[PDB]
Amino acid sequence: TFGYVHGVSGPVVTACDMAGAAMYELVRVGHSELVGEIIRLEGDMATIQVYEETSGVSVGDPVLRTGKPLSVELGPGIMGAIFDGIQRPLSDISSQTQSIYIPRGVNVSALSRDVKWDFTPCKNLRVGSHITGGDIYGIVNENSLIKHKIMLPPRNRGTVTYIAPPGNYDTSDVVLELEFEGIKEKFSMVQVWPVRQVRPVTEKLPANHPLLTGQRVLDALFPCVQGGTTAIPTVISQSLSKYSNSDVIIYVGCGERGNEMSEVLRDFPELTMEVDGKVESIMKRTALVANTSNMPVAAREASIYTGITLSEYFRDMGYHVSMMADSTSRWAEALREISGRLAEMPADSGYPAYLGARLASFYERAGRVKCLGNPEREGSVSIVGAVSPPGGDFSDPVTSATLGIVQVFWGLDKKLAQRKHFPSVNWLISYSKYMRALDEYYDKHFTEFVPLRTKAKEILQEEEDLAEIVQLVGKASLAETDKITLEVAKLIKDDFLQQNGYTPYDRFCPFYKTVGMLSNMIAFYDMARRAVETTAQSDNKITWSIIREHMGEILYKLSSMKFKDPVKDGEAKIKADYAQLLEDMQNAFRSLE
Amino acid sequence: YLSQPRLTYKTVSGVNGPLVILDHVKFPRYAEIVHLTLPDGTKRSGQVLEVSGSKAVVQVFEGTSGIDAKKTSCEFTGDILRTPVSEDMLGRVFNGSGKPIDRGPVVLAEDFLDIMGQPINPQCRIYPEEMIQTGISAIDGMNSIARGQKIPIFSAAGLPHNEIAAQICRQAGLVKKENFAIVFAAMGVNMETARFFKSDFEENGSMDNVCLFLNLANDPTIERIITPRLALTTAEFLAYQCEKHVLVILTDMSSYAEALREVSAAREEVPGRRGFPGYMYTDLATIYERAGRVEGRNGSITQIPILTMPNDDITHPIPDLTGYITEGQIYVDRQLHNRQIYPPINVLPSLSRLMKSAIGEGMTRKDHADVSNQLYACYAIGKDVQAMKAVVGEEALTSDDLLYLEFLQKFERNFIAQGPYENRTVYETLDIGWQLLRIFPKEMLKRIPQSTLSEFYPR
Amino acid sequence: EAQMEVDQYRREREQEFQSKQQAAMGSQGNLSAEVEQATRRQVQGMQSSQQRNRERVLAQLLGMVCDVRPQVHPN
Amino acid sequence: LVQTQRLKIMEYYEKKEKQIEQQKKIQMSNLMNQARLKVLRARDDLITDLLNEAKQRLSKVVKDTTRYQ
């Protein structure tokens, strides 16, 4: 309960009179109450690392012992709140202090202790019902979209002897008093869970449903699933926040720059979404974790664990969370400097030896689960990491030890950026290992797409092993089946994998229109191949350069598929246009032969 | 045996990372297992790291997050880490520590074997003789694996080496013209490839051959180091005491060495070359050299390690030392995976250094030597014509360089291309291999001698 | 005439597409029920050999439990 | 060509027939798998009850005193 500072030495504090102190448990160092973490016991002393600036901490300062490690507050009031990497609400320290600064040792509640929430019990409990860890006993109308479900803590069970009457409550009163055998206890409306502990589940279901990202590339050739893990080495993350099939977004910037973090907090309360014809601010179904590089280095490493623990909490209600964890490589640079303070031996380029263990302890909390509780729920957490290598390599220990863990790699390069292509998709080092899990969704609902996806990845590959000779030799003595797979292959690279994100046709790409565009482009490839191979020996052998001059008006309708608006036009107004065009592609070849 | 009761200390002198250091210990053994129980009740396990007089440094497996030096009880065992082996564990799925995860019961032991293992007497080895038939044509036709060979599969991240390993395990057997088993160790896997391995082998009907050790990525990095030693002590019971032929597949041995580098640096050791431990050559050798046939027993162990080369580097010390102890390589290639070929196995760099003893008459068939090096020459001469055709065009190639480009369109799509469920037996990877060698006349096949050209070409 | 091979010739191989549909109904009743007879026969081979060796190994167990021998560690 | 329009439909119904016959062997493998587990649990229950008889025969010695001192 009481320690004393025996000696500080930089951000590491040695405390005495700490006999029963646990590892990684929280302490309040100093007279200003700096939050710390016990990292090394030696007998009755306790080496503490301080989560704040240590200047002015004398010896003989009191060290309060709490009994609980670094943990977040879970409850109603989270959605819309701007937190820190140790969950300090930055939109309320700016009010209760009325300054531009974060003073040392602030103790602001992470959830507000003044807002009255409308409690609604689950109408199937009573005074004398049996309830165990995970059973929903309340519903809070947090805002219009989120039905905030109150849940029992895991490893807590018994019989209810007090349920709270439906009304309006704050997050401090005693809403639930169930009893275990002999001992009565009390539950509030907020719960507290340690950020390095996995929130428990019943079973981990396979991730078999596609995460609809709003784009044409990355959703046909390299698909992601609900419950999957990606890597992006803001137009891919802002697109998922408006249109995708996720009900809670969690944006976690670990060590991002100050002006690029003040950019996002300016932009998200202006964004809108389309729910039922009404427009709604997207800051009703997201919560950010703001963290810059001026912040404590101990609160930058913990921002990833706070972000996924917040992400796992809204999973258990039954929502499908999608967490974007921006700048994973900044998070590893927080692991490099903690390990240097401990005098830990580095393994690879100064990074600790456990860089892969900590990343697999974060990326493997994603996935579709069967949620712990009574009403048979099902939620999921998608994690979208973002490695920033030192100039686009797989040599650093952060980029290469992410690709040994994740399943999707949305591999981007810097050379393929000045084409004004936008995205900077590479499609040679980018993969997706959710092609075998999605062989049931594609074959049942879409039943045609896997052989077109097999061909369309091949046409863009045969172009590569031609293009080195097309540069050096230059199209002089070439076969005519290769001129198909350079002009049809060019038609893909400007009309299928080409985007521009502020336009009224290319901010959402629905998937039935996405397979509708490839249903014509592969058919034009195979009919150009079947023409050139059966008319290779008989009489009046043709090349490509007699077709593209003759069928110049066919190559305009096959190039004006990306410019049809998916938003103004009808749902069936776009497939018939792609089904009428096929008979302008089946009859058109029968005008040459 | 060990009939004395066990001491349960609560004299913890400190915690420093994953190390718990006790004091006033009565005669502590080295590498002895302890069982820590936390204040709240969570039982964790750990292994003794260093003894010094009355001290003991214990490396807790599941971390030290919640251990205090006042109320933690650390019960010593007195015996080192051993496994229970049985023949009825063929058909189970264990994790890295050896506990079942297939809703199964605990394995009733026939023996308790020390998992570190003793080396084999080098006089008591026999040279590998017969063939292990995998079912993949690219490693049975031209890169054949003996009985007792150690041949690693070299690949990279993103490449489908994990489905090659699952297709070997479904179809591995003998070379038929009751004693075959497979011990599949999976180190450093994620969840979505752990339920690929757990689901593929159990509903493709051949779970009864395979004993699956699945060590996850989120599981402790010490439990990844005892995973290939649990799998090889099971294989050394099943083969050298039950006379089975065992195939030992170790998946992603570059993930063993990333957990060995992590366990070494958390033991407060100083790293060696490229950050890896200095004893990395004699640490893989304790795994790889648990193989081969033995004198006086009818079993064998053939190993197939699998590697992931970072940045396609070969001078990295995980492929450097694997190619230094093991005999050949397989070389899953990236330029074939982008062209949609399964399995994407490159032939030109791959090699089996004991392939000339696993083939022949009375082992596979008489022409398996002369077919394989003939398809190897025509695969190389075609791939020069494949690049040369782009330089000069099609109108400048003769009726010689068209036989090699028409063979090359059918060697990659019929010999290399297999599909994941098509078990080509080795008698059918030669008839595939002959009906590509009929695109050429008998005046062109230089690598085949004329006596077997008369017996196998005209059909 | 050959364009009439679209809507009539598909009902020729539908006698093969229906051939396994009733052969999905035949092997089903003997799948689970016949192996359930073997998972009961294999159990009665355990308990037949359980009672012939129970009192033998209960005496070796309880006899070794009630052993007094107080050995010391060396020094 | 009348030959050809059979086989493009036949390939849509050799593919379905290679599918259910694979689906037949999944059912036979999922039941032979739990066959070995249900018989391995009926070997574990006989052991964990043999120790329950050795836990009750152990307490028939603590009632004694000349054999327990």
UniProtKB/Swiss-Prot annotation, chain A:
| Catalysed reaction, written as an equation | ATP + H2O + 4 H(+)(in) = ADP + phosphate + 5 H(+)(out)
* UniProt xrefs under HAMAP family: ATP_synth_A_arch
KW Disulfide bond (keyword) present: no
Q: What family is reported?
A: Belongs to the ATPase alpha/beta chains family.
> Known EC number(s)?
7.1.2.2
Extract one GO molecular function annotation from the record.
ATP binding
Please tell me whether the keyword Phosphoprotein is annotated for this protein.
yes
Query: From what superkingdom does this record's organism come?
Result: Eukaryota
Q: Which GO terms describe its cellular component?
A: clathrin-coated vesicle membrane; cytosol; lysosome; plasma membrane; transport vesicle; vacuolar proton-transporting V-type ATPase, V1 domain
Annotated PROSITE patterns: ATPASE_ALPHA_BETA
Signal peptide span per the entry?
Answer: none
Q: What is the native source organism of this protein?
A: Bos taurus (Bovine)
PTM section of the record: Phosphorylation at Ser-361 by AMPK down-regulates its enzyme activity.
Name of the coding gene: ATP6V1A
This protein is called V-type proton ATPase catalytic subunit A
Q: What class of enzyme is it?
A: translocase
Q: How is its activity regulated?
A: ATP hydrolysis occurs at the interface between the nucleotide-binding domains of subunits A and B. ATP hydrolysis triggers a conformational change in the subunits D and F, which induces a shift of subunit d. The c-ring is subsequently rotated and results in a continuous proton translocation across the membrane. The V-ATPase is inhibited by bafilomycin A.
Q: How does it sit in the membrane?
A: Peripheral membrane protein
List the expressing tissues: Expressed in brain (at protein level).
- Name the predominant localization: cytoplasm
Q: Where does the record place the modification Phosphothreonine?
A: T120
Q: Which residues carry this modification: Phosphoserine?
A: S361
- Subcellular localization, as worded in the UniProt entry: Cytoplasm; Cytoplasm, Cytosol; Cytoplasmic vesicle, Secretory vesicle; Cytoplasmic vesicle, Clathrin-coated vesicle membrane
From Swiss-Prot, chain B:
Query: Where does the chain bind ATP?
Result: R353
Gene Ontology CC: one annotated term: plasma membrane
**Record membrane topology:** Peripheral membrane protein
UniProt keyword Nucleotide-binding, yes or no: yes
Q: In which tissues is it expressed?
A: Expressed in brain (at protein level). Expressed in all tissues tested, but highest in brain and in adrenal medulla.
Q: Which UniProt keywords apply?
A: ATP-binding, Cell membrane, Cytoplasm, Cytoplasmic vesicle, Hydrogen ion transport, Ion transport, Membrane, Nucleotide-binding, Synapse, Transport
Disulphides: none
Q: Which Pfam families match?
A: ATP-synt_ab, ATP-synt_ab_N, ATP-synt_VA_C
Please give one Gene Ontology molecular function term for this protein. Answer: ATP binding
PROSITE patterns to which the protein is assigned, alphabetical: ATPASE_ALPHA_BETA (PS00152)
The principal localisation class reads membrane
Subcellular location, in the record's words?
Apical cell membrane; Melanosome; Cytoplasm; Cytoplasmic vesicle, Clathrin-coated vesicle membrane
Superkingdom classification of source = Eukaryota
Q: Which InterPro entries match?
A: ATP-synt_VA_C, ATPase_a/bsu_AS, ATPase_F1/V1/A1_a/bsu_N, ATPase_F1/V1/A1_a/bsu_nucl-bd, ATPase_V1-cplx_bsu, P-loop_NTPase, V-ATPase_su_B/beta
Q: Which GO terms describe its biological process?
A: ATP metabolic process; pH reduction; proton transmembrane transport; vacuolar acidification
Q: Which family does it belong to?
A: Belongs to the ATPase alpha/beta chains family.
Q: What does this protein do?
A: Non-catalytic subunit of the V1 complex of vacuolar(H+)-ATPase (V-ATPase), a multisubunit enzyme composed of a peripheral complex (V1) that hydrolyzes ATP and a membrane integral complex (V0) that translocates protons. V-ATPase is responsible for acidifying and maintaining the pH of intracellular compartments and in some cell types, is targeted to the plasma membrane, where it is responsible for acidifying the extracellular environment.
Q: Which organism is it from?
A: Bos taurus (Bovine)
Swiss-Prot record, chain C:
Compartments annotated for it: namely: Melanosome; Cytoplasmic vesicle, Clathrin-coated vesicle membrane
- List, in alphabetical order, the GO biological process terms annotated in this UniProt record: pH reduction; proton transmembrane transport; synaptic vesicle lumen acidification
Q: Which UniProt keywords apply?
A: Coiled coil, Cytoplasmic vesicle, Hydrogen ion transport, Ion transport, Membrane, Transport
Known role: Subunit of the V1 complex of vacuolar(H+)-ATPase (V-ATPase), a multisubunit enzyme composed of a peripheral complex (V1) that hydrolyzes ATP and a membrane integral complex (V0) that translocates protons. V-ATPase is responsible for acidifying and maintaining the pH of intracellular compartments and in some cell types, is targeted to the plasma membrane, where it is responsible for acidifying the extracellular environment.
The protein here is known as V-type proton ATPase subunit G 2
User: Where is the signal peptide, in residue numbers?
Assistant: none
Q: Care to name a GO molecular-function term for this sequence? A: ATP hydrolysis activity
Curated annotation (Swiss-Prot), chain D:
- According to the UniProt record, list the residues that bear Phosphotyrosine: Y12
Oligomeric state and interaction partners are given as: V-ATPase is a heteromultimeric enzyme made up of two complexes: the ATP-hydrolytic V1 complex and the proton translocation V0 complex. The V1 complex consists of three catalytic AB heterodimers that form a heterohexamer, three peripheral stalks each consisting of EG heterodimers, one central rotor including subunits D and F, and the regulatory subunits C and H. The proton translocation complex V0 consists of the proton transport subunit a, a ring of proteolipid subunits c9c'', rotary subunit d, subunits e and f, and the accessory subunits ATP6AP1/Ac45 and ATP6AP2/PRR.
Q: Per its UniProt entry, which superkingdom is the organism in?
A: Eukaryota
Provide the free-text tissue specificity comment from this protein's UniProt record. Answer: Expressed in brain (at protein level).
Q: Which family is annotated?
A: Belongs to the V-ATPase E subunit family.
Subcellular location as annotated = Apical cell membrane; Cytoplasmic vesicle, Secretory vesicle, Synaptic vesicle membrane; Cytoplasmic vesicle, Clathrin-coated vesicle membrane
Biological role stated in the UniProt entry: Subunit of the V1 complex of vacuolar(H+)-ATPase (V-ATPase), a multisubunit enzyme composed of a peripheral complex (V1) that hydrolyzes ATP and a membrane integral complex (V0) that translocates protons. V-ATPase is responsible for acidifying and maintaining the pH of intracellular compartments and in some cell types, is targeted to the plasma membrane, where it is responsible for acidifying the extracellular environment.
State the covered range within the intact protein. Answer: 45 to 113 of 226
